[PDB]
Structure 1
Amino acid sequence: MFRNQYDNDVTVWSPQGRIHQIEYAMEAVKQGSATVGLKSKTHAVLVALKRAQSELAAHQKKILHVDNHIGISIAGLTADARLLCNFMRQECLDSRFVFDRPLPVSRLVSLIGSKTQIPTQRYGRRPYGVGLLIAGYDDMGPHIFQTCPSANYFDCRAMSIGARSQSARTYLERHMSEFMECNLNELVKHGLRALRETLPAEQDLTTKNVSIGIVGKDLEFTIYDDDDVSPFLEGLEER
């Protein structure tokens, strides 16, 4: 009630010391659909749930390709995800041009942090309403990063973001002690079981609603979609 003067702009501090448009942008992230990221000692996989209005539409393109070693999964506003993906792709190109080597994932994520922090201080802007799960591979191994509308980024052992992603995070917290020595097949299965935990008890993972993206020691970032996910889904025990 005493909140109405201080939550309409990202340039107003509430007398409790809170910016409220930042928190509302975080809600905008929660309005997507669940996507999961997890990594082993050699691979970093991204698993996403697609919505297509349940019929007559090709599903959302939820996993995007940024470079040969970086790929992102989005939850939140699509326009913001595309703006940030264009930024990431341009930065990776610039690194390859100037320095001839793949841009480190942590450096890319730091650049995203600055870029998305500027709208949360300036007038006439709004925070980015998209949260990302960045999967990378560089000299330092696999990486999973989570970026937020607040311009925070986190180094994750595993992470789920999106709508009803708390269930996936509960699964990942329960099972993260065995992710590292998993091979690619059962790592993708772990991600698939977490993503399934974000679903009603009746619905089940199919090829039509699952998108997978692997990067790893030998692999470049590849996205598996709509029929390429069948090898990964065939072996997934029932719930």
Structure 2
Amino acid sequence: NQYDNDVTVWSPQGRIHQIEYAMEAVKQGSATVGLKSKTHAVLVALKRAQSELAAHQKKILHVDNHIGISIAGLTADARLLCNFMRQECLDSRFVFDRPLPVSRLVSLIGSKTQIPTQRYGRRPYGVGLLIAGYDDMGPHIFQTCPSANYFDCRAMSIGARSQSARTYLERHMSEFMECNLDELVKHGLRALRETLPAEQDLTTKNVSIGIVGKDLEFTIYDDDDVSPFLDGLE
């Protein structure tokens, strides 16, 4: 495979041959799901415990002052990318003295992770962010990707076997743009509760969620605070 010395090369059909393989490298990562309402967007993540027991490698991250993220791929590379995103979001707090809008945020990181895809001997940022925030208009949510091609989506799921969570979540878009926080996050957890290997429970340990929107800071619900979100039997 002479296309192994390879973020400079092209496969002869159209393929760049490893920054879609970084998309494989975030298919391998842990599953998560974010979505948006008409008022406030939510993020929900299950956290893998590949150890004795842990904080299970805490996924959703505080970047911001209402522009929160959800990583899924490499963790050190994710932390590098959110120190970038974090630092220049605070730089837009410093200079312009307004909240940095979510679209320009995700676009300029979409131009920051695009440079090592271009040049030589530098791997792409193999992490699939699932960023979500509430700017002036409705609470946006952006999947971006290691191929530096973000998506202004609503209700996206990325991670391990997250396609089933999408196909639950695709056929339940009609009860979005309504459906307040108490009945919205239930509707996201029963979207997350399909990526699990078919044995019964979204426990309080592994599920960490985040809420952002109108008149509330991006708020992280850890091991304790996810316990008021409880329902569903399947």
The TM-score with structure 2 as length reference comes to 0.97
116-125 vs 196-205, which moves further: 196-205
Q: Structure 2: how far apart are the matches of 1:154 and 1:7?
A: 28
Query: SS in structure 1 opposite 2:91?
Result: helix
Q: Give 1:121's aligned residue.
A: 118
- Contact 1:39 1:45 survives alignment (8 Å): yes
- Contact 2:186 2:231 survives alignment (8 Å): no
Q: Structure 1: how far apart are the matches of 2:128 and 2:159?
A: 8
1:218 matches 2:215: yes
Give the CA RMSD over aligned residues: 1.2
Query: SS in structure 1 opposite 2:139?
Result: strand
Q: Structure 2: how far apart are the matches of 1:42 and 1:115?
A: 30
- Contact 1:143 1:155 survives alignment (8 Å): yes
Q: Give 1:103's aligned residue.
A: 100
- Contact 1:8 1:21 survives alignment (8 Å): no
Q: Structure 2: how far apart are the matches of 1:180 and 1:169?
A: 18
Task: Give aligned-pair identity as a percent.
Answer: 99
1:172 matches 2:173: no
Q: 1:179 Cα deviation (Å)?
A: 1.4
Q: Structure 2: how far apart are the matches of 1:229 and 1:134?
A: 20
Q: Structure 2: how far apart are the matches of 1:7 and 1:182?
A: 49
195-204 vs 172-181, which moves further: 195-204
Q: 1:114 Cα deviation (Å)?
A: 0.4
Bigger strand fraction = 1
Q: 1:234 Cα deviation (Å)?
A: 4.5
104-113 vs 199-208, which moves further: 199-208
Query: SS in structure 2 opposite 1:223?
Result: strand
Report how many aligned residue pairs link the two structures: 234
The TM-score with structure 1 as length reference comes to 0.95
Q: 1:137 Cα deviation (Å)?
A: 0.3
- Contact 1:71 1:135 survives alignment (8 Å): yes
14-23 vs 152-161, which moves further: 14-23
Q: Structure 1: how far apart are the matches of 2:105 and 2:137?
A: 14
Show structure 1 runs of 4+ deviating over 3 A: none
- Contact 1:7 1:19 survives alignment (8 Å): no
- Contact 1:196 1:205 survives alignment (8 Å): yes
Deviations 1:96-132 (A, max 9, x none): 1001100000000001100111111100201111001
What are the ranges of 5 or more consecutive residues in structure 1 without an aligned counterpart? Answer: none
Q: 1:54 Cα deviation (Å)?
A: 6.0
Query: SS in structure 2 opposite 1:112?
Result: helix
